Amino acid sequence: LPQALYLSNMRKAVKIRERTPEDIFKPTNGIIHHFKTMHRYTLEMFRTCQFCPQFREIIHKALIDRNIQATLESQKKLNWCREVRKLVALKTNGDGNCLMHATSQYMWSVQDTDLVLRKALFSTLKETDTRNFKFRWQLESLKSWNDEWDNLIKMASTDTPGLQYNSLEEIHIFVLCNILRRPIIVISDKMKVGGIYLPLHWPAQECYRYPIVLGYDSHHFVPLVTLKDSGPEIRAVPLVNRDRGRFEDLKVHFLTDPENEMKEKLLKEYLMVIEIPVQGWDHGTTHLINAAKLDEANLPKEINLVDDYFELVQHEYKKWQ
Amino acid sequence: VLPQALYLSNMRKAVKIRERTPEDIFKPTNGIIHHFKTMHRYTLEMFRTCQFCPQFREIIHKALIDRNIQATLESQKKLNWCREVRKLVALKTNGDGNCLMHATSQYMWSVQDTDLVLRKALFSTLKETDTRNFKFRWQLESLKSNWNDEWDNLIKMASTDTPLQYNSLEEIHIFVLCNILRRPIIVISDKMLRSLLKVGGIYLPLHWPAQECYRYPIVLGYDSHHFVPLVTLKDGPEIRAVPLVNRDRGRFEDLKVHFLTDPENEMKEKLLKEYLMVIEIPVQGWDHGTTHLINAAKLDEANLPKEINLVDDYFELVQHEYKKW
Ligand SMILES: [Cl-]
Ligand SMILES: [Cl-]
Ligand SMILES: [Cl-]
Ligand SMILES: [Cl-]
Ligand SMILES: [Cl-]
């Protein structure tokens, strides 16, 4: 069983990566270039239950970053809430482009090996209007000096730095979510790239309202995808975590002062927020907390890798019974 | 960058192809050998590497081509010796004791016999039908250079039992297989210079009338107990054909035609012309001045549709990776 969803059908993978550049629109009147359609796709991982455990495991060893899954779960950041669906970390290349590999995988089930997303980011930074991105970043930086913005720009390039590409940071995630017109939520031990990145350069009416969910640990991003057909739990990611006996909101990055004053209203415009009951620290109490709905799997026939990988799996499982 | 082995190019499609094979097998109730209904008619061709640059060619060749067998067979003047004819190229094949089947399966379908469909069909024939005529023909051939004991061992060798991962197959197993496929198999084998390899030669599906058989051969190479498919290279004006004789110094030596009865051998040329499309090609003489006509069989055009062609998916991957400079 191949070690990556893409590998079940390398031909189709190339076809997927080939569609991506053509789906990018470049308005050329100041507005940021963005995806026309492909940002609306979501991958889900197939179950490995309803299989033997010896076999359930084999699949899990090939596709899943178990090191990062265990770390994030042991710190109570990933899959802490018993009411919601389990998320699973998919293996991602650690070459310095993992932000883009994880994001590309979450939507399209391929990594960014043609550097389409990485180049799109660099393009926007080196070309488009970045006045407001810079203001937001100064404002966030001062909440704790200026060749810094210029080097943040150079970091997004494809230049060799010691990994093969420069590592990316919070502002790059924020720019990326505006290129995708889709929120990105990062689950990490510091939840400082952990937290919620909203496409605030766009009206929420022009954005996809289900997030991309990534995990982050040790300078490495992975996608955290939903596992298919494991109801009855809620298909959402909580927008808070337990922290020292209370619920603490995930950080929302790069807000202006007026945005911050209406943080909850913004989350509710850019995500599908639902208020769900979870168990209290007092076993006699329940609390309502906010969560954002996750998308159902929708990668079409032609560009759905995971159904190809799953078909391989079913074939070898029959042989392995 | 590029995959290192053909099958990596579309594993889902390989599975689809493999899954089709057992359902194409027809099993008669009247004692007739089980055989393929439709899939035996398929033939792969390899794509050209000429349009690319040496560092790139090197990677496509290391990935796909068995260059050791290709060089062994060419250096003996057994493979690619006629200037009249299109080049054949040896594809890498898994060396697990099932390579007769992997090579045969690749020649037709671009996949190896990794579900053991061909290997099982061979064993099932040997194990579950009357094999009296196969046994007779094998006896005559054995004597031309305890019968019950030895026949049982050859049936046993055909099984999927570990002895490699499987028992190596030999000539009678190729003859059985060509009758399951209703398609001749021609083996081009390593062989000591005569001045100083019995698996080499021509296997005809003599349990069928020629009109019920496909009349383009499967072409395999053999060396160091390993089979590979020798697939035609896309190119003519050169013509698609495989010579049915070898040079032997200043003369020619017919490829061996295996397992014939006595009257069949007396009419061997007639028989070859029934089961193959035998043409004559002029070659330079290594004794007399000029030139001599030798027999060759025509080889099939590529007909393995894209839908079931790893090599086509492979080539498109090469195109993509190439344009990246
Ligand atoms: Cl909970
Ligand atoms: Cl939308
Ligand atoms: Cl707590
Ligand atoms: Cl409580
Ligand atoms: Cl011979």
Swiss-Prot record, chain B:
Q: Which gene encodes it?
A: TNFAIP3
Q: What sequence ranges are listed for the domain OTU?
A: 88-233
Q: Where is this protein found?
A: Cytoplasm
Name its species. Answer: Homo sapiens
The UniProt annotation puts the region (Interaction with ubiquitin) at: 168-170
User: Could you name the active-site residues?
Assistant: 96, 99 (nucleophile), 226 (proton acceptor)
Which part of the complete sequence is present?
A: 5 to 356 of 790
Which classification does the entry list for the species?
Eukaryota, Metazoa, Chordata, Craniata, Vertebrata
Protein name per UniProt: A20p50
Effect seen on changing residue 99 to A: Loss of deubiquitinase activity
**Stretch list, region TRAF-binding:** 54-269
